């Protein structure tokens, strides 16, 4: 159904044949980032739910794979599995939690 990520197609008639106009999505402008598999926080390993942990020169973010939409690393979009000495390439960073500013108010 075409080359790229398929969205739609439109048929057209032709003499002794058919013609398909496949609509596809193609990524355009890539950018380099520094990545890591997991985030170590308080002796816990945080993995992304559906996304990728990337970093610019200072901070760390979690974003979707096919588009650059960075967001703050939160316990809402991450899950905890085990501790920090089982993952190769784990990096230390803090993980924001939404309940704490509600508690400190």
């Amino acid at each position: 159904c075409g080359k790229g990520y398929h969205l739609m197609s439109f048929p057209q008639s032709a003499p002794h044949g058919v013609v398909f106009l496949h609509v596809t999505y193609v990524p355009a402008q890539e950018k380099n980032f520094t990545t890591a598999p997991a985030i170590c926080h308080d002796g816990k390993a945080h993995f992304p739910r559906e996304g990728v942990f990337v970093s610019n020169g200072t901070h760390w973010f979690v974003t979707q794979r096919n588009f650059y939409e960075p967001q703050i690393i939160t316990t809402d979009n991450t899950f905890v599995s085990g501790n920090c000495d089982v993952v190769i390439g784990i990096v230390n960073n803090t993980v924001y939690d939404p309940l704490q500013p509600e508690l400190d108010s």
């Binding site: 080359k3 790229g4 990520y5 193609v26 990524p27 355009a28 890539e30 990545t35 598999p37 997991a38 390993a45 993995f47 559906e50 990728v52 794979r65 599995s81 085990g82 089982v86 993952v87 190769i88 390439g89």
Partner: protein, 99 residues
């Protein structure tokens, strides 16, 4: 004195044409596909080549088959050892069995 079949086939008007693509070019296509697959996953098949670490690519595949990626990230050495033993089994079977 040992007359071949191919000499009689050529002398009786039958000719075998050579293919357009040589084995070196076929192997270079295979090498390009392997290098693109290893260093970019599937993104090179859908546009530009996007680099990714291979452990994270395998975690993407594990999420593809419905398994949580911590299973990969806590069993990476065992999975790599199983892959190496499987590749050795394939090369030993191809060395042994000719059928």
């Amino acid at each position: 004195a040992a007359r071949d079949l191919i000499c009689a086939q050529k002398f009786n008007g039958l000719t075998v044409l050579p293919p357009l693509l040589t084995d070196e070019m076929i192997a270079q296509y295979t090498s390009a596909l392997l290098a693109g697959t290893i260093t970019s996953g599937w993104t090179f098949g859908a546009g530009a080549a996007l680099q990714i670490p291979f452990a994270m690519q395998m975690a993407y595949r594990f999420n593809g088959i419905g398994v949580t990626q911590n299973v990969l990230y806590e069993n990476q050495k065992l999975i790599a050892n199983q892959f190496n033993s499987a590749i050795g089994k394939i090369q030993d079977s191809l060395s042994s069995t000719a059928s």
